[PDB]
Scaffold this active site. Structure first.
Site, short mmCIF file in Angstrom:
data_model
loop_
_atom_site.label_atom_id
_atom_site.label_comp_id
_atom_site.label_asym_id
_atom_site.label_seq_id
_atom_site.Cartn_x
_atom_site.Cartn_y
_atom_site.Cartn_z
N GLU A 35 130.55 57.34 27.04
CA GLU A 35 129.64 56.21 26.91
C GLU A 35 129.37 55.86 25.45
O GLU A 35 129.31 54.68 25.10
CB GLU A 35 128.31 56.51 27.59
CG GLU A 35 128.37 56.56 29.10
CD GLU A 35 128.58 55.20 29.74
OE1 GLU A 35 128.53 54.17 29.04
OE2 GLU A 35 128.86 55.14 30.96
N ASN A 46 126.12 43.26 27.02
CA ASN A 46 126.84 42.89 28.23
C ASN A 46 126.80 41.39 28.44
O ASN A 46 125.99 40.67 27.85
CB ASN A 46 126.24 43.60 29.43
CG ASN A 46 126.27 45.10 29.27
OD1 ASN A 46 127.34 45.68 29.14
ND2 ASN A 46 125.11 45.72 29.23
N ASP A 48 125.79 39.68 30.95
CA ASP A 48 124.57 39.17 31.56
C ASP A 48 123.42 39.05 30.55
O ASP A 48 122.33 38.62 30.94
CB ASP A 48 124.17 39.99 32.79
CG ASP A 48 123.72 41.41 32.46
OD1 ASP A 48 123.68 41.78 31.28
OD2 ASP A 48 123.41 42.17 33.41
N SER A 50 122.03 41.62 28.93
CA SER A 50 121.40 42.90 28.74
C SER A 50 122.18 43.69 27.69
O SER A 50 123.28 43.33 27.29
CB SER A 50 121.33 43.67 30.05
OG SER A 50 122.63 44.04 30.48
N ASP A 52 123.08 47.90 26.44
CA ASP A 52 123.06 49.33 26.70
C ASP A 52 122.74 50.08 25.41
O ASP A 52 123.26 49.76 24.34
CB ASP A 52 124.42 49.79 27.22
CG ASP A 52 124.83 49.12 28.51
OD1 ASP A 52 123.95 48.81 29.32
OD2 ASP A 52 126.04 48.94 28.72
N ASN A 59 120.65 50.81 30.25
CA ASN A 59 120.67 49.35 30.26
C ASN A 59 119.28 48.73 30.31
O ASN A 59 118.39 49.20 31.03
CB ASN A 59 121.49 48.89 31.47
CG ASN A 59 121.70 47.40 31.50
OD1 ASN A 59 120.98 46.67 32.19
ND2 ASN A 59 122.69 46.94 30.76
N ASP A 101 118.05 57.65 41.44
CA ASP A 101 117.83 56.32 42.00
C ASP A 101 118.63 56.06 43.27
O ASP A 101 118.38 55.04 43.94
CB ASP A 101 118.22 55.26 40.95
CG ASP A 101 117.62 53.89 41.24
OD1 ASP A 101 116.40 53.82 41.47
OD2 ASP A 101 118.38 52.90 41.20
#
Ligand SMILES: [Cl-]
Ligand SMILES: [Cl-]
EC number: 3.2.1.17
Length: 129
Positions: A35, A46, A48, A50, A52, A59, A101
């Site tokens: 990562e 990203n 969209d 957002s 990271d 995110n 989650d």
């Protein structure tokens, strides 16, 4: 901070990630390698809108607030900048929420594509743990 492999493994163990939700330490070290290349200051934007953040590329659409991801949640209740610290506590605490989650470590795309199903124990071999 750019961690060494065994230095990060030891830090993650002290913070309770070894076998957290059944994921052995090597899974977490492998995820961090791919990562962020073990760099706490890593960021990536990203499509969209957002971003990271940090050693585990957490995110901003769901997990932290960066002030520029409209209609996002802040489920870890932290500014995203806290995830870039040389102290990995905030990243680890938020990662524990993410992995709980429902999808486990599949939340990390690099883990699914580069660590899942491989010999992840290799990532902690040679380390004094
Ligand atoms: Cl392991
Ligand atoms: Cl799981």
């Amino acid at each position: 901070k750019v961690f060494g492999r065994c230095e990060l493994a030891a830090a993650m163990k002290r913070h309770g990630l070894d076998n957290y939700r059944g994921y052995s330490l090597g899974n977490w070290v492998c995820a961090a390698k791919f990562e962020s290349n073990f760099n706490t200051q890593a960021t990536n934007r990203n499509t969209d809108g957002s971003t990271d953040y940090g050693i585990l590329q957490i995110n901003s659409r769901w997990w932290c607030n960066d002030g520029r991801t409209p209609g996002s949640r802040n489920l870890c209740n932290i500014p995203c900048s806290a995830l870039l610290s040389s102290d990995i506590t905030a990243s680890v605490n938020c990662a524990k929420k993410i992995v709980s989650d429902g999808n486990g470590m599949n939340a990390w795309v690099a883990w699914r594509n580069r660590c899942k199903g491989t010999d992840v124990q290799a990532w902690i071999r040679g380390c004094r743990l």
